[PDB]
Design a protein around this ligand. Structure first.
Ligand SMILES: Cn1c(-c2cccc(NC(=O)CCC(=O)NCc3ccc4c(c3)OCO4)c2)c(I)c2cc(C(=O)O)c(O)cc21
Length: 264
């Protein structure tokens, strides 16, 4: 893990946008930013706003795409749905609670069951909240106001059991969970990138995107194929820096992948 933490003593890519004054309070952590070449660009924003194209997120495509970004901020909730809509995403993976260890990891941006809110030009209708053990599945209807013909379902799997400290002592919950999200994403033909976030959108988020990428490998090739965790992390970090910030989260990806193979 350290042979890679060092490999980032310097960054091979530019993150000039996130620093612009106007995008200053559009990030949760001043130091965590998105590389200009992968970052999600937001079109069609309030023409009264100078910069409405920025959102702290990065398209992550294995080299099924993903979109890693931060947990919503009170002032970014509308930029968030604009991304969802613009990107045509149908699945959302919340990996953080709304407040861990007493602090705000993410702001609520989905309306209560049966309810319906409006975020800028976007409308969201929670048509039914179901809640299993490790997570809660919320069926949402997103659409741009003034145009109901654009409406589409956007399932939001909200993992809730992840410990405030450390990582799951066992990968079972994360695997059944991801397993669901996989098939759900597969059923929706022409869906956009799966979104996955957390406080900053790089640690825990990266742990999921990564585990999922490898498990997809094990579904296509078998339990025999070769898994290179370290080459994979570098692979995503080239699209978004910091993916996976701890050794424990690193070891998890390993225990995660093996376990899955055991299951098979
Ligand atoms: C572990 N970690 C860290 C991360 C990395 C380095 C340091 C910290 N620091 C801490 O606050 C822990 C300190 C502690 O012992 N508590 C006492 C305490 C807490 C809050 C207070 C306070 C005192 O005084 C005022 O406030 C967190 C990140 I960033 C991070 C991000 C993710 C992700 O998915 O995005 C993740 O899954 C894990 C992550």
């Amino acid at each position: 893990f350290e042979t890679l933490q060092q490999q980032e003593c310097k960054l091979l890519y530019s993150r000039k946008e996130g620093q612009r004054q106007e995008n200053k309070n559009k990030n949760r952590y001043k130091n965590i930013l998105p590389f200009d070449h992968t970052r999600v660009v937001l079109h069609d924003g309030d023409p009264n706003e100078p910069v409405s194209d920025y959102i702290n997120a990065n398209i992550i495509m294995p080299e099924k795409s993903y979109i890693a970004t931060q947990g919503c901020l009170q002032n970014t909730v509308n930029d968030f749905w604009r991304m969802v809509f613009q990107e045509n995403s149908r699945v959302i993976v919340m990996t953080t609670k709304e407040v861990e260890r007493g602090k705000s990891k993410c702001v609520k941006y989905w309306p209560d069951e049966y309810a319906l809110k409006e975020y800028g030009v976007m409308r969201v209708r929670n048509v039914k909240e179901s809640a299993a053990h490790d997570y809660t599945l919320r069926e949402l209807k997103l659409s741009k106001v003034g145009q109901g013909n654009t409406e589409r379902t956007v399932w939001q799997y909200h993992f809730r059991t992840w410990p405030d400290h450390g990582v799951p002592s066992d990968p079972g919950g994360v695997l059944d969970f991801l397993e669901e999200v996989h098939h759900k994403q597969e059923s929706i033909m022409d869906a956009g990138p799966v979104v996955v976030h957390c406080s900053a959108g790089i640690g825990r988020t990266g742990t999921f995107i990564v585990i999922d990428i490898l498990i997809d490998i094990i579904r296509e090739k078998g339990v025999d194929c070769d898994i290179d965790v370290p080459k994979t992390i570098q692979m995503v970090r080239s699209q978004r820096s910091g993916m996976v910030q701890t050794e424990a989260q690193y070891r998890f990806i390993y225990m995660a992948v093996q376990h899955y193979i055991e299951t098979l």
